[PDB]
Design a protein around this ligand. Structure first.
Ligand code: ZN
Ligand code: ZN
Ligand code: ZN
Ligand code: ZN
Length: 288
């Protein structure tokens, strides 16, 4: 019988391995079979494109995919739609303008709300500080980055609703660990009583952790990252970072599979002029 396929960005790290495991568990629950793939050449747009082309010419009734880029899978996804394959976009949004021009569509898009991610980091801080609140800072990504501005907005709006919080600094460190160490050093020098710092990514958070240690404030300042990369997860366990907000890869994969399977049951792929289904899967707070 026709099966399902999933194309992931890679299979070489715990995030994507956990997505694979989420998919496998949900397939058992739904009683469907799934084959999970990643491109042979890591990070290579063309390698992933060739993989997806080939998979579209097998016997899969649906394919879910996490594209390496908005740009790389437009044409074979359009062809797969024309063939009646049920398609679900995971994680990184395909270039939907170009996909429409190419004569295709997808059933659904499944990702995480970056506004909520920033709110979750700020909410951790708010809850931990309690009624007495205090001075806090945000270490931003590069200005104009969609994901980074969403995280900054969400954290800022969450802090604003908490009367007891004073946002004393919000400054970019451009996704860079060395810059984050420098910015955080400057921020802590100016406001030595800061009680917490939210950073828009873990690369920057690790730099901030060093800044806090250099000031003698490890265990006295809450340091919160975003992504849950392995090095930052170790810092959380060690007390060098306090928490990090991550996506829930297992839930992204399970949700994507269920949407694919539900669509397939309808007997016809989504019309070209219909907006795909849209799911923003809840993020998770990592504190151990
Ligand atoms: Zn198979
Ligand atoms: Zn506002
Ligand atoms: Zn400096
Ligand atoms: Zn843990």
């Amino acid at each position: 019988a026709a099966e399902y396929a999933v194309v992931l960005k890679t299979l070489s790290n715990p995030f994507w391995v956990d997505m694979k495991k989420g998919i496998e568990d949900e397939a058992k629950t739904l009683g469907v079979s799934v084959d999970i793939f990643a491109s042979p050449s890591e990070g290579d747009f063309q390698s992933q494109l060739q993989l997806f082309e080939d998979l579209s010419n097998k016997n899969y009734k649906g394919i879910a995919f996490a594209p390496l880029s908005s740009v790389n899978l437009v044409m074979p996804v359009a062809r797969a739609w024309k063939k009646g394959i049920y398609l679900v976009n995971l994680d990184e949004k395909i270039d939907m303008d170009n996909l429409k021009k190419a004569g295709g569509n997808v059933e659904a898009f499944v990702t995480t709300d970056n506004v909520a991610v920033g709110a979750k980091g700020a909410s951790f801080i708010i809850d931990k500080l309690g009624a007495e609140g205090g001075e806090v800072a945000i270490i931003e990504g590069k200005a104009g980055n969609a994901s980074g501005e969403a995280r900054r907005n969400g954290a800022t709006e969450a802090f604003k609703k908490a009367s007891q919080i004073k946002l004393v600094a919000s400054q970019p460190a451009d996704w860079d660990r060395i810059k984050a160490l420098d910015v955080a050093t400057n921020v802590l020098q100016r406001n030595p009583n800061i009680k917490a710092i939210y950073c828009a990514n873990d690369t920057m958070a690790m730099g901030v952790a060093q800044a806090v240690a250099n000031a003698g404030k490890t265990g006295k300042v809450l340091v919160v990252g975003t992504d849950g990369i392995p090095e930052a997860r170790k810092m959380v366990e060690a007390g060098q970072m306090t928490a990090t907000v991550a996506q829930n890869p297992a839930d992204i994969g399970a949700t994507g599979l269920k949407l694919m399977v539900d669509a397939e049951k309808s007997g016809k792929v989504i019309p070209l002029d219909k907006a795909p289904e849209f799911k923003l899967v809840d993020s998770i707070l990592v504190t151990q």
